[PDB]
Amino acid sequence: QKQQSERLGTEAIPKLLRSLSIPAMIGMFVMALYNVVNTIFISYAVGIEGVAGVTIAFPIMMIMMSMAGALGIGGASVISRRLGERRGEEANQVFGNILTVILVLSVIGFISAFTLLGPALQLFGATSVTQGYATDYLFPILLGSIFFFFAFAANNIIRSEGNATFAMVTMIVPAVLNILLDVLFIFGLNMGVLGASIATVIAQASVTGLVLRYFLTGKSTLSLHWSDLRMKGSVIKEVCLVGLPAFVQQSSASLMMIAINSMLLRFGSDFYVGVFGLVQRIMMFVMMPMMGIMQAMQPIVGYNYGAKQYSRLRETVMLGFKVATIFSIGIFALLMLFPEALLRVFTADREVIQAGVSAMHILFCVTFLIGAQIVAGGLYQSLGKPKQALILSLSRQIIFLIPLVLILPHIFGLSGVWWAFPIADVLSFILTVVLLYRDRNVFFLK
């Protein structure tokens, strides 16, 4: 019991999602812009060498980010599950008693920066060139760790409450900055990776300075305390609880895409790593459309569970679903009528727009089904019972994906790329379907 500051708690619930989604739909899309408009520089004051440096260094970023993402997520499904179920002050506690574990790692990172940086880095396809870059990239980042962590937790929990809007602005803003911040060093100076890396710390600092405001200054949305608010609850236990499947999802994908970057450093030293980098943020970029919808419900389907209008949250979940789908099929179509013009950035041989696009062809006759497949995941999450969600990811990401590449690559070919995805994913979808007639309670409406 505290004071539920504006945002909502309202039951104006379709425009809830509507004007809870779009802020992700924007922020994300723009940080997706930054990603873009940043890298391309590093194809300039440096060529493609460091562009790999990054692409290898990359996963090691996500290593922490998964860790603070679990952290960030817990928060979001706790704090909403406790703002319908209105233990208002518990939230206050949580918030801070997370900031603990963060500041724990915001140090461990600092530590390993000075420690495990190289040790780990060198450990795979260490092209004497791209090596230094990744270091010169990674060294800053870890220093460095602190702002980074915070800002994602924060920009996650503020969704967990209601502020996808100021989220917008925890977002839009590093972006715009970073752009002009990089330009600054990378090009205008010549602090290449070396300093587009410090450009993006000065980014994640400058937000944090701001996030303190929207958490101290006119302590917006909610229960937000600062002196001894936190300590180290036995609540800690309770977010690692929510988060376990959260940091799995990444440390499933992340821990597997270091591999496919470095097994491809044994074949294509740098030519083929920059194009990994490339294929991602078109998955990711035109993931967003989905991704964003989910974070709407994240807290919506959060304080609605929380002993409130069970009635109207299914409304969320059916709608939730209902939308997604139309983007599932939307992307999917657009992802297989324009696999041509998107391989018109990949312009090379007339064989490149062949088995290059053959994978991209029916590799993704799956897409339209992916909608649910992921909606489901925030709705075992917006409702702290990720034990089934725990269950879930391990299918999609590992215990069905890997045990499919492997069973085509024993020997089945560049067919072992293709069938391995299309189909692994659909066993994952079929599976999910059953976890909801397992639980005729989320969607206890149709």
Residue numbers in the entry: 3 to 448
Please, what does the article write about this entry?
Integral membrane proteins belonging to the multidrug and toxic compound extrusion (MATE) family contribute to multidrug resistance by using either the Na+ or H+ electrochemical gradient to extrude drugs across cell membranes. MATE proteins identified thus far can be separated into the NorM, DinF and eukaryotic subfamilies based on amino-acid sequence similarity. Those crystal structures revealed a similar protein fold comprising 12 membrane-spanning segments (TM1-TM12), they nevertheless suggested different arrangement of cation- and substrate-binding sites between the NorM and DinF proteins, hinting at substantial mechanistic diversity among the MATE transporters.
We replaced DinF-BHD40 with asparagine, mimicking a constitutively protonated aspartate. This mutation abrogated the transport function, likely because the protein was trapped in a protonated state. We also soaked DinF-BHD40N crystals into low pH (∼4) solutions, and determined the structure to 3.0 Å resolution by combining molecular replacement and MIRAS phasing. The low pH-soaked structure of DinF-BHD40N is largely identical to the un-soaked one (root mean squared deviation (r.m.s.d.) <0.5 Å for 447 Cα positions), ascertaining that the protein was indeed locked into a protonated state. Tellingly, TM1 in DinF-BHD40N is no more bent than that of DinF-BH, suggesting the notion that TM1 is kinked in an extracellular-facing, protonated MATE transporter is not always applicable. The most functionally important difference involves the side chain of DinF-BHD40N, which participates in an H-bonding network also involving DinF-BHY36 (TM1), DinF-BHN180, DinF-BHD184 (TM5) and DinF-BHT202 (TM6). In this network, the side chain of DinF-BHD40N forms an H-bond with that of DinF-BHD184. By contrast, in the deprotonated DinF-BH9, no such interaction was observed between DinF-BHD40 and DinF-BHD184. Taken together, we suggest that H+ evokes substrate release by breaking the charge–charge interaction between the deprotonated DinF-BHD40 and the bound substrate, and by engaging the protonated DinF-BHD40 in an H-bonding interaction with DinF-BHD184. Our results suggested that the protonation of TM1 in DinF-BH induces the release of substrate without entailing significant structural changes in the extracellular-facing transporter, including the bending of TM1.
